């Protein structure tokens, strides 16, 4: 239950709501919906302040295995790129689970995401 | 005229579903004798309404529309200050309220939001109803999406046995649009329809709503897979068939093989 | 009272708005609906043309394997069209699927130089990206200013399966060896009527400024702009299909109740703290 109130947080940026769950005991790696992580919604639309959160705790910055893709790229096709920046700052390398040169290459064409490659 | 109605339905299935409203309107102008029949046989984008009194939104439909006004499932009153609008029997209205509440939870359990509306109307030896469901995706994302649910079941209560015959006929309407430079303007809408009939047992633990719910759930679940297959499946495949980014290894065989088979009919036949 | 003139315009819009590989069906539907052959004839021919026209309908002259295309740029204006490839006059029969009775057309040979070049040039580009598509370059003079119009077509009808498709591409190349500009518009339409109604209408307008040089050189330069532009247009389309199937779609409804287990109506019909 409350599944919505939980995920609905990483959406509206209710960093105050998600902060309650994690406040328990480092719990950022569960299957949000049924096959996704609580970092996709935050990155795609986490005011850029939710990702850095549930991120500094665990490290789902790569935990993704069945998703055959990391959250870093999630922001790519989002236009935010505001997170990807302060993201790599923690490592998130640049291509740990990326199809290959896609990352920013086969991603888009804007200089924002390109901020990596040429 | 019967044939006309059939042709009208076939036309709406051919013309772009993105202009169903405009087309539908024009279709009526061409045949004002099929307005009602078309206003109940042609599915169009579910419109959203507000219930000041209740302050809640309710979808519109030809099943809950009387003349030029619509009947709200919450307050049970048409938006437009009507006088003697068609209303369901006091006993029926009660069942309608429970259906709206029951489906209300089924909408937040599958859609986790959006709007839903249910309208019922007694019949000759039973009663029918329509379950509407509208869910819009994030309005802040580059790509937009809209899910319209239109279910029309027909219960056939039985004299004895309490067993009634159900005849559902949902019709999901998936809409997808995106205004990106790389894709300028891309619209991928439509809608699939599927009928379903089966006899179920009516009891205290399994009432009408319960039965109707099971059907709708199973119907939507089945349509949810077909939509993903056709939409992000067939269509896509067809698109890749039109052109290809990678140079297609020209083939002389096919062409050379066609020349033979051809000259066969041009120089023979039979 | 919707005058007859109004009804005619509506019937024409429906016919001229039929999907690729479903003109007849729509036509027959309108006829039965209009219930007035007399009025149908009024704007019957005008409709057929406009359709085949705005539908780069690829026709095959009697015997010229010129699978040319039917557009407005090739609209003679007397009932026949134009053929830059073979350079011959042919009468297209909207109704019938055949259009023979051609007529030699001695082009002016003014802007042909560019055409002939681009034409064949674009002939390979299509035979390397379009399985069953056709092209038809047009070398005409627009109010003095010269321009090279290259039209590309490609479709894959398949009714027995309920679903058709067709690719469109018009590229306008004015003139001004001062740097060369450009201006085209891509189009894509897909239909799948197998118990419902799903279509994929999409179009992209582009406007770039290319540099004019030689004849065979500028030609290859153009085919390069379209190849890159078209490739980018198709690529962006495939990407949208992924996000629309791995985000939006999953953003609409759910594949399973949050409770992760078929709903329990029995629990939704009172399960309110009951007893």
UniProtKB/Swiss-Prot annotation, chain A:
Q: Which SMART domains match?
A: ANK (SM00248)
Q: Name the Pfam families on file.
A: Ank_2 (PF12796)
Residues with the N-acetylcysteine modification = 2
Q: Where, subcellularly, is it found?
A: Cytoplasm; Nucleus; Cytoplasm, Perinuclear region
Task: Mark the residues carrying the PTM Phosphothreonine.
Answer: 31
ANK repeat ranges per the UniProt record: 2-30, 34-66, 67-99
Against SUPFAM superfamilies, the record matches this protein to: Ankyrin repeat
Gene Ontology cellular component annotations, sorted alphabetically = cytosol; F-actin capping protein complex; nucleus; perinuclear region of cytoplasm
> Which keywords does the record carry?
Acetylation, ANK repeat, Cytoplasm, Nucleus, Phosphoprotein, Repeat
Give the modified residues of type N6-acetyllysine.
Answer: 4, 11, 24
A Gene Ontology BP annotation from the UniProt entry: regulation of cell size
Top-level taxon:
Eukaryota
Q: According to its UniProt entry, what is the function of this protein?
A: Promotes dimerization of NF-kappa-B subunits and regulates NF-kappa-B transcription factor activity. Promotes growth of cardiomyocytes, but not cardiomyocyte proliferation. Promotes cardiac muscle hypertrophy. Plays a role in the regulation of the growth of actin filaments. Inhibits the activity of the F-actin-capping protein complex formed by the CAPZA1 and CAPZB heterodimer.
Quaternary structure and partners: Interacts with RELA. Interacts with the heterodimer formed by CAPZA1 and CAPZB.
Q: Which family does it belong to?
A: Belongs to the myotrophin family.
Write down the PANTHER family for this protein, in alphabetical order. Answer: ANKYRIN REPEAT DOMAIN-CONTAINING PROTEIN 39-RELATED, BRCA1-ASSOCIATED RING DOMAIN PROTEIN 1
Protein known as = Myotrophin
Organism this protein belongs to: Mus musculus
Curated annotation (Swiss-Prot), chain B:
Pfam families attached to this UniProt entry: F_actin_cap_B
- Which InterPro entries does the protein's record reference? CapZ_alpha/beta (IPR037282), CapZ_alpha/beta_2 (IPR042276), CAPZB (IPR001698), CAPZB_N (IPR043175), F-actin_capping_bsu_CS (IPR019771)
| Domain of life from the UniProt record | Eukaryota
Q: Which molecular function GO terms apply here?
A: actin filament binding
What's one GO BP annotation on this UniProt entry? Answer: negative regulation of filopodium assembly
Keywords on record: Acetylation, Actin capping, Actin-binding, Cytoplasm, Cytoskeleton
Residues with the modification N-acetylserine, per the entry, are 1
SUPFAM superfamilies xref list: Subunits of heterodimeric actin filament capping protein Capz (SSF90096)
Q: In which tissues is it expressed?
A: Isoform 1 is detected in pectoral muscle, cardiac muscle and gizzard. Isoform 2 is detected in brain and liver (at protein level). Isoform 2 is the predominant isoform of nonmuscle tissues and isoform 1 is the predominant isoform of muscle tissues.
Report the GO terms under cellular component. Answer: brush border; cortical cytoskeleton; cytosol; F-actin capping protein complex; hippocampal mossy fiber to CA3 synapse; lamellipodium; membrane; postsynaptic density
Which PANTHER family does the UniProt entry name for this protein?
Answer: F-ACTIN-CAPPING PROTEIN SUBUNIT BETA (PTHR10619), F-ACTIN-CAPPING PROTEIN SUBUNIT BETA ISOFORMS 1 AND 2 (PTHR10619:SF0)
The similarity annotation says:
Belongs to the F-actin-capping protein beta subunit family.
Task performed by this protein? F-actin-capping proteins bind in a Ca(2+)-independent manner to the fast growing ends of actin filaments (barbed end) thereby blocking the exchange of subunits at these ends. Unlike other capping proteins (such as gelsolin and severin), these proteins do not sever actin filaments. May play a role in the regulation of cell morphology and cytoskeletal organization.
Subunit structure and binding partners: Component of the F-actin capping complex, composed of a heterodimer of an alpha and a beta subunit. Component of the WASH complex.
Name of the protein in its database record: F-actin-capping protein subunit beta isoforms 1 and 2
Curated annotation (Swiss-Prot), chain C:
Q: Which Gene3D superfamilies match?
A: F-actin capping protein, alpha subunit, F-actin capping protein, beta subunit
Q: In which tissues is it expressed?
A: Present in all tissues examined.
- Cross-referenced InterPro entries, in alphabetical order? CapZ_alpha, CapZ_alpha/beta, CapZ_alpha/beta_2, CapZ_alpha_1, F-actin_cap_asu_CS
Q: Name one GO molecular function term.
A: actin filament binding
Q: Which spans are transmembrane here?
A: none
Q: Where in the cell is it found?
A: Cytoplasm, Myofibril, Sarcomere, Z line; Cytoplasm, Cytoskeleton
Q: What Gene Ontology cellular-component terms does the record carry?
A: cortical cytoskeleton; cytosol; F-actin capping protein complex; plasma membrane; WASH complex; Z disc
Per the record's keyword annotation, is Iron included, yes or no?
Answer: no
Grouped into one coarse class, the protein's main location is cytoplasm
Q: How does it assemble?
A: Component of the F-actin capping complex, composed of a heterodimer of an alpha and a beta subunit. Subunit of dynactin, a multiprotein complex part of a tripartite complex with dynein and a adapter, such as BICDL1, BICD2 or HOOK3. The dynactin complex is built around ACTR1A/ACTB filament and consists of an actin-related filament composed of a shoulder domain, a pointed end and a barbed end. Its length is defined by its flexible shoulder domain. The soulder is composed of 2 DCTN1 subunits, 4 DCTN2 and 2 DCTN3.
Family, per entry = Belongs to the F-actin-capping protein alpha subunit family.
Q: Which PANTHER family match?
A: F-ACTIN-CAPPING PROTEIN SUBUNIT ALPHA, F-ACTIN-CAPPING PROTEIN SUBUNIT ALPHA-1
Biological role: F-actin-capping proteins bind in a Ca(2+)-independent manner to the fast growing ends of actin filaments (barbed end) thereby blocking the exchange of subunits at these ends. Unlike other capping proteins (such as gelsolin and severin), these proteins do not sever actin filaments. May play a role in the formation of epithelial cell junctions. Forms, with CAPZB, the barbed end of the fast growing ends of actin filaments in the dynactin complex and stabilizes dynactin structure.
Query: What is the name of this protein?
Result: F-actin-capping protein subunit alpha-1
Organism of derivation? Gallus gallus (Chicken)
């Amino acid at each position: 239950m409350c599944d919505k109130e939980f995920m609905w947080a990483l959406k509206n940026g209710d960093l105050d709501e998600v902060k309650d769950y994690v406040a328990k005991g480092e719990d950022v790696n569960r299957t949000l919906e049924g096959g996704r992580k609580p970092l996709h919604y935050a990155a795609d639309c986490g005011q850029l302040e939710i990702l850095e959160f549930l991120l500094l705790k665990g490290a789902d910055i790569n935990a993704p295995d069945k998703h055959h893709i990391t959250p870093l790229l999630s922001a790519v096709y989002e236009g935010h790129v505001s997170c990807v920046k302060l993201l790599l700052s923690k490592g998130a390398d640049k291509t740990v689970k990326g199809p290959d040169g896609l990352t920013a290459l086969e991603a888009t064409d804007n200089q924002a995401i390109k901020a990596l490659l040429q | 005229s019967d044939q006309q109605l059939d042709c009208a339905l076939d036309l709406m299935r051919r013309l772009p579903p993105q202009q169903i409203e405009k087309n539908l309107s024009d279709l009526i102008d061409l045949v004002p004798s099929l307005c009602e029949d078309l206003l109940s046989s042609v599915d169009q984008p579910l419109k959203i309404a507000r219930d000041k009194v209740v302050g809640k939104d309710y979808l519109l439909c030809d099943y809950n529309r009387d003349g030029d006004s619509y009947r709200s499932p919450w307050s049970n009153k048409y938006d437009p200050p009507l006088e003697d609008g068609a209303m369901p029997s006091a006993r029926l209205r009660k069942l309608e309220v429970e259906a709206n509440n029951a489906f209300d939870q089924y909408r937040d359990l599958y859609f986790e939001g959006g709007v839903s509306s249910v309208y019922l109307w007694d019949l000759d030896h039973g009663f029918a109803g329509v379950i509407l469901i509208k869910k819009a995706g994030d309005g802040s994302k580059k790509i937009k999406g809209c899910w319209d649910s239109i279910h029309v079941v027909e219960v056939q209560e039985k004299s004895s046995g309490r067993t009634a015959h159900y005849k559902l006929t949902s019709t999901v309407m998936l809409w997808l649009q995106t205004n990106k430079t790389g894709s300028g303007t891309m619209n991928l809408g439509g809608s699939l329809t599927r009928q379903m009939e089966k006899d179920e047992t009516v009891s205290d633990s399994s009432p009408h709503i319960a039965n109707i719910g099971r059907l709708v759930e199973d119907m939507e679940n089945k349509i949810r897979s077909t939509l993903n297959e056709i939409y992000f499946g067939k269509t896509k495949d067809i698109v890749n068939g039109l052109r290809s980014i990678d140079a297609i290894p020209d083939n002389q065989k096919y062409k050379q093989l066609q020349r033979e088979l051809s000259q066969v009919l041009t120089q023979r036949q039979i | 009272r919707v005058s007859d003139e109004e009804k005619v315009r509506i019937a024409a819009k429906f016919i001229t708005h039929a999907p690729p590989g479903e003109f007849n069906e729509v036509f027959n539907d309108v006829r039965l609906l209009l219930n007035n052959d007399n009025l149908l004839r009024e704007g019957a021919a005008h409709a057929f043309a406009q359709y085949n026209m705005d539908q780069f309908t690829p026709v095959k002259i009697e015997g010229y394997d010129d699978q040319v295309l039917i557009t407005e740029h090739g609209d003679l204006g007397n009932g026949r069209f134009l053929d830059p490839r073979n350079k011959i006059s042919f009468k297209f029969d909207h109704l019938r699927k055949e259009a023979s009775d051609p007529q030699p057309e001695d082009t002016e040979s003014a802007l042909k130089q560019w055409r002939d070049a681009c034409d064949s040039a674009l002939r390979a580009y299509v035979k390397d990206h379009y399985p069953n598509g056709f092209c038809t370059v047009y070398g005409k003079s627009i109010d003095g200013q010269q321009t090279i119009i290259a039209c590309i077509e490609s479709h894959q009808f398949q009714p027995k399966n309920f679903w058709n498709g067709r690719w469109r591409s018009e590229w306008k190349f004015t003139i001004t060896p001062p740097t060369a500009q450009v201006a085209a518009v891509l189009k894509i339409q897909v239909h799948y009527y197998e118990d419902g109604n799903v279509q994929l209408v999409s179009h992209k307008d582009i406007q770039d400024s290319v540099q004019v040089s030689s004849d065979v050189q500028t030609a290859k330069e153009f085919i390069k702009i379209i190849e890159n532009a078209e490739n980018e247009y198709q690529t962006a389309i495939s990407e949208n299909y992924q996000t629309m199937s791995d985000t939006t779609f999953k953003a609409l409804r759910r594949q399973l109740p949050v409770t992760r287990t078929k709903i329990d109506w029995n629990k939704i019909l009172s399960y309110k703290i009951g007893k």
